Amino acid sequence: GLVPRGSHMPPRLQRFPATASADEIFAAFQEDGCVVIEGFEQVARFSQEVDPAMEKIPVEVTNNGNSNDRTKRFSKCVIASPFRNEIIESDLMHELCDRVFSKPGEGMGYHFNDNMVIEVQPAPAQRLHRDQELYPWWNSMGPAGPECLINFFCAVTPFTEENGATRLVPGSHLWPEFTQINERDCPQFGKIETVPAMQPGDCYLMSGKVIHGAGHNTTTDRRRALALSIIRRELRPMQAFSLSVPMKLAREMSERSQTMFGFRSSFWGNDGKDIAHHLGLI
Amino acid sequence: LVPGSHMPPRLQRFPATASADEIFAAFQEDGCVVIEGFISPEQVARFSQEVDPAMEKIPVEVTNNNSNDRTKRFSKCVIASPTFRNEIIESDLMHELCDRVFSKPGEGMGYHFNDNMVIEVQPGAPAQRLHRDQELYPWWNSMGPAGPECLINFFCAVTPFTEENGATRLVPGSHLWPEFTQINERDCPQFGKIETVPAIMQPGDCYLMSGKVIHGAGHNATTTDRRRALALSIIRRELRPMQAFSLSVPMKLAREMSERSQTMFGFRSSVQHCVDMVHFWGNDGKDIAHHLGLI
Ligand SMILES: C=C1[C@@]2(C)C[C@H]3[C@]4(C)CCC(=O)OC(C)(C)[C@H]4CC[C@]3(C)[C@]1(C(=O)OC)C(=O)[C@@](C)(O)C2=O
Ligand SMILES: O=C(O)CCC(=O)C(=O)O
Ligand SMILES: O=C(O)CCC(=O)C(=O)O
Numbered sequence A: 001g002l003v004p005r006g007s008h009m010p011p012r013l014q015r016f017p018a019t020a021s022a023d024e025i026f027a028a029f030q031e032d033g034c035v036v037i038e039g040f041e042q043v044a045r046f047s048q049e050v051d052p053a054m055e056k057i058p059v060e061v062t063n064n065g066n067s068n069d070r071t072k073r074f075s076k077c078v079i080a081s082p083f084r085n086e087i088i089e090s091d092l093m094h095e096l097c098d099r100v101f102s103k104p105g106e107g108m109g110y111h112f113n114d115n116m117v118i119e120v121q122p123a124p125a126q127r128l129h130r131d132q133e134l135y136p137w138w139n140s141m142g143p144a145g146p147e148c149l150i151n152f153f154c155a156v157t158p159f160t161e162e163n164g165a166t167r168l169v170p171g172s173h174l175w176p177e178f179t180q181i182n183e184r185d186c187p188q189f190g191k192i193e194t195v196p197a198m199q200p201g202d203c204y205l206m207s208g209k210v211i212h213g214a215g216h217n218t219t220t221d222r223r224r225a226l227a228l229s230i231i232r233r234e235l236r237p238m239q240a241f242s243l244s245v246p247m248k249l250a251r252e253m254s255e256r257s258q259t260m261f262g263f264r265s266s267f268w269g270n271d272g273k274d275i276a277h278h279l280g281l282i
Numbered sequence B: 001l002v003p004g005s006h007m008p009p010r011l012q013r014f015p016a017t018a019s020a021d022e023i024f025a026a027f028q029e030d031g032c033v034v035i036e037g038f039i040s041p042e043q044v045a046r047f048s049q050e051v052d053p054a055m056e057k058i059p060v061e062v063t064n065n066n067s068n069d070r071t072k073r074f075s076k077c078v079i080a081s082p083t084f085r086n087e088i089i090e091s092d093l094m095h096e097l098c099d100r101v102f103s104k105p106g107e108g109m110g111y112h113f114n115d116n117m118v119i120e121v122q123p124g125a126p127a128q129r130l131h132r133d134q135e136l137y138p139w140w141n142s143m144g145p146a147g148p149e150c151l152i153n154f155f156c157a158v159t160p161f162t163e164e165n166g167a168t169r170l171v172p173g174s175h176l177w178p179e180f181t182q183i184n185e186r187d188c189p190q191f192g193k194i195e196t197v198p199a200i201m202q203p204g205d206c207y208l209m210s211g212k213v214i215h216g217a218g219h220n221a222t223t224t225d226r227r228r229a230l231a232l233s234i235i236r237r238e239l240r241p242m243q244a245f246s247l248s249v250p251m252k253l254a255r256e257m258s259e260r261s262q263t264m265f266g267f268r269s270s271v272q273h274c275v276d277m278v279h280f281w282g283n284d285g286k287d288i289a290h291h292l293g294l295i
């Protein structure tokens, strides 16, 4: 008795506590392409730390169909928030990444693509898209292809259906053909059943194959999010973290986090040697 | 020609003064093309000389094995060779050809360096296993010949490439087979039945090869011939390089690069359009070359 008996049931979107087993969350990730992780205070210290840089972002009102139309985005999160000390060291984050990406005896098969705070000003709904469209050939491999990208999308201010929270399409990672989602390329355009995604500090772990998009935003609510995009070791990051994150901060990171930001190798080597030698990190 | 004698596969040859369009058409037909005089004889000789000290401090590895040993590999070419960083990577024919492969309309350079590797095959080095270079990106074969290009290689003769000294063995038109598998006994049904052809080249000649082309370094059946090559490996802007050039190449040398050379090594971003635009390998909305100081 989850929907009134006889009702059409909407797409399934499982929810796990931040204390749940990694293999339990992972089976739900494979089943639907996305899961919620409730509980993934630290969220408050972070928002306050990033709030000044947020305030120095002017808003554009363009009615252009762009993703910048009344949506604020900021990436220098390691520079701006002592995040770089607590948030990225989730032993469950790595627990999941290592199940999605790593192979036995290659160590870490993953690293960071971006660390982005997204704040939808009260803004047209984002176009529906797969994240893996960032690597434009991936869709051509269809649902049999390997994962390139997963996203720990974390709520900062709460996610109402009013402030424009992300609308996810669970199960779109198993559709036979992966297309652009528009009226010309997507036969299912307009019949696509979305499910809106949430309280601060909770994260939904989404595959790069799942259709989704930010909805329309209210009068007062700036709905703020924090995206942890993590990609295959073989793919290139959107952010050049090891060129803009200062060496002072890289020295305080763990071996595994230096790898996530490319201050360390596992690809991205230095003539047969780990790049961390030449940088002075033993 | 040969005498009813079987005729081995055709590897096309062009001079470096041929138009990029004629070379590219042959590249598309066959997946590989020789560009003669890709580098001048005087440039190759100066490059060979400028890296030779580094090439002499590299110990030859000999092992008890089928593991691509007795092959020196050196990648600090920008640091060690002014002829390389000031002249070789500024080949316009190289960039002309890279655009025809990689660059989408209105998104700038679609490509950057994966590696710059001197490969010196020692006397007696065993032959390499037949392989496609895009096996580096393990999912790529699964898109088969319809797939987009992962990488191309400008593989230049620094010293002569002969059949005896281990010039690369190529399989022209293997970029067009219907199934791309690893080349082993379990997965490849033509295993042991694959016809190769060597890349016979003088110094400064190069071949240009798709990642979809099966190939392998031959066996060096000489006693005194160290067969040297310079591999300029070039990948799509969305793929990760094997060398972290922006972290080991010094900024002194970065400031003396053209903007397109800076982009090749990750000292500068390229802008991909998806509705939306995004500087790839950027800095929170801006080109990374601002924070690095390159303007
Ligand atoms: C330009 C855009 C790209 C190409 C990349 C994308 C991306 C890195 C990719 C999806 C992912 O996995 O991670 C996150 C959530 C961090 C996003 C963050 C936002 C941007 C930078 C982007 C944008 O801001 O447009 C001006 C978009 O909104 C979007 C979805 O259209 C894109 O595909
Ligand atoms: O802003 C959101 O809620 C979704 C983020 C997203 O999908 C993107 O920008 O890529
Ligand atoms: O050295 C050669 O001729 C071939 C080298 C090669 O193909 C490789 O190392 O990938």
Ligand SMILES: [Fe+3]
Residues within 6 Å of the ligand: A129, A130, A131, A212, A213
């Ligand atoms: Fe998205």
Ligand SMILES: [Fe+3]
Residues within 6 Å of the ligand: B131, B132, B133, B215, B216
């Ligand atoms: Fe090769």
